Design a binder for this molecule. Sequence first.
Ligand SMILES: [Zn+2]
Ligand SMILES: [Zn+2]
Ligand SMILES: [Zn+2]
Ligand SMILES: [Zn+2]
Lengths: 384, 384
Amino acid sequence: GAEHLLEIFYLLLAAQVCAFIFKRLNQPVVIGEVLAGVLVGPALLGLVHEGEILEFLAELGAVFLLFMVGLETRLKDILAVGKEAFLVAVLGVALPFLGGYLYGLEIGFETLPALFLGTALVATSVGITARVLQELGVLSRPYSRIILGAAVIDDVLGLIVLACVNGVAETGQVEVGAITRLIVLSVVFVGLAVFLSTLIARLPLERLPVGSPLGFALALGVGMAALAASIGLAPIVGAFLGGMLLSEVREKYRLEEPIFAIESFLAPIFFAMVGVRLELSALASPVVLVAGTVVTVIAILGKVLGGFLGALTQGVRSALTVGCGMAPRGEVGLIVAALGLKAGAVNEEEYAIVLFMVVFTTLFAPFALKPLIAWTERERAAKE
Amino acid sequence: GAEHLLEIFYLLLAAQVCAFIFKRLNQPVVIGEVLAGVLVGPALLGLVHEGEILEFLAELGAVFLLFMVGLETRLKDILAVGKEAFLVAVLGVALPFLGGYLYGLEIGFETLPALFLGTALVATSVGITARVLQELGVLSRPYSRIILGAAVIDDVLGLIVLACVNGVAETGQVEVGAITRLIVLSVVFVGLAVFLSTLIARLPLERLPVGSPLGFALALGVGMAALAASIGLAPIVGAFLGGMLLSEVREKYRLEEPIFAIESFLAPIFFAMVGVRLELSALASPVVLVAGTVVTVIAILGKVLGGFLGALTQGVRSALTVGCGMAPRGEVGLIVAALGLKAGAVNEEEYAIVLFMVVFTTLFAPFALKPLIAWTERERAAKE
Ligand SMILES: [Zn+2]
Ligand SMILES: [Zn+2]
Ligand SMILES: [Zn+2]
Ligand SMILES: [Zn+2]
């Protein structure tokens, strides 16, 4: 009870300070937050441990980050680049998967673990990316919108991939009905969201028996997350979509600011808690470091190239920035790794090898992403 | 995982609607929120159940409510009526306790349960009261400040009373050292808070390695709660105090608004969750309803009179409004009731009898409190 108030305190103070240290280095804040979680977490101070409660708070954090982003992101905006979104997504799943599975077959990983390698390489944590794009006030740009939309598609794709894989881990075949069911639930949910959001501005909440337009927004957001999560998608997606629903009425209701407040309350906990859940396996470990480094380069190159190719339309400058913005694996890669360990599909060694790369990718990606944003905005002025 | 997103959704929608129903009846919103928790909770819909997570979120809600109130409440303000605060507090514990214990001896309650009756009658849930005082934009008035300060004292008093009682439940004597230790920890913590807050404006956070004045505030608030809770006080108090620390720098940092946002996110969950945790014992029950009604009148009259007498200085009009604002027992009475059941100190019958009165007091009090506020402000204009 005071356990959790204490822990939350630690997370907040560490995250505030680490954010200060990283702000003063012209480096993005997200890294500070994650490192704060590593700082106070098991790895170093052991002040903060993994709690069902701390994990859920972290979840809400990710949610509000994405609700915030969708609030400033309209359908017209993402659709108008939706083809590059789609392409970036599909290539982003295809390329590091094959690379993953192939590289698994070569070290000596068996068919099922190798499949899990490709699986982990498929994942994408737009939470982190979003945090950066938000910081540099860039959420409006084309590459950021392609990143968002493509991320949304990338989620349904990744879910199908994991459904297939857990399927072959449990019985050995892929339950086709389950797959198609997920595809239908996903497509219907997303399309229903989109439809709903071409109708939001036309109907101000006024006749709704709600007590405040904000309270309405919070429900039509947390609820969107919940819905997404019940279908089998990441809550972050329900969140983003819920944001889009209300983005054509955002300014009209003074929503941008109080949502931004909540986000900048819970998001640090989310990123910190990502840092909390990173393990000391890459410490004094060999095959882990070697195979890990290789699978890491395969991961980054897979994502970055998929992105570069899908949105090559906007010219190289944007294309890497999308690709690079698809790199980090964060809480997602962590999750796939955990499920991999549980169902007896991955040794603690192969788990160390995957964890190494979700850690390195999570760290590396937002570094490279910052100058890439500058090197794209400087070039956008010479054609402005 | 989607369990908790779902539940939270239900709580939010019900609370928004119930708030709408109660707003349209010129009745305070808190009642709507609690009833929403009763609506969706075990008692009716069983959509939302008690979760360790939902309980903790509820806690944070109460915290932010009180951080919010302390942010708009300075030391000078409470001190300048601190004697009525003190008096109101001590009488507020003394009078319903004796009434409680005496009335226990008369029904047939044994010494230990009767002591628990007086105990429950001692409790006070300023959370609810604060929610009302906030709604009617009255947090600045004298009676509201006496209510707050007196509530703070009332907390240390109640803690000492419960320490004594759990003491006689466990061994049969009162561990004197434990008591005095609590008194010292409490006095030192509160005084240290006060001292700290005469020094806050003089030192803007600027030289602190914090990433934002708001993030600082959130830490110096959740942390204050945590501290309070480790000493053995309600987190609500750490919260309020933390608010006061930053109230002499509130406007300077644009804190009032984002804190108000978070409060009006989590507070409904808190009040709803109070409603969730109310049991169907007073349903088709006799001795429960009788003895419950009596102990309820004793509860209300005890609190209201204590308040009336402590702050009689400000004239009858304010005096009842303080007294009445001390009436509700909410999450506190609920807590004392639970601990009473656990340590084998109270039968399910006597528990029904206490629960009946925490429920009726919690409901009744904010009703009477609204016209009492009007009937005090109308009279304050004829001497304005
Ligand atoms: Zn716990
Ligand atoms: Zn812990
Ligand atoms: Zn749970
Ligand atoms: Zn439940």
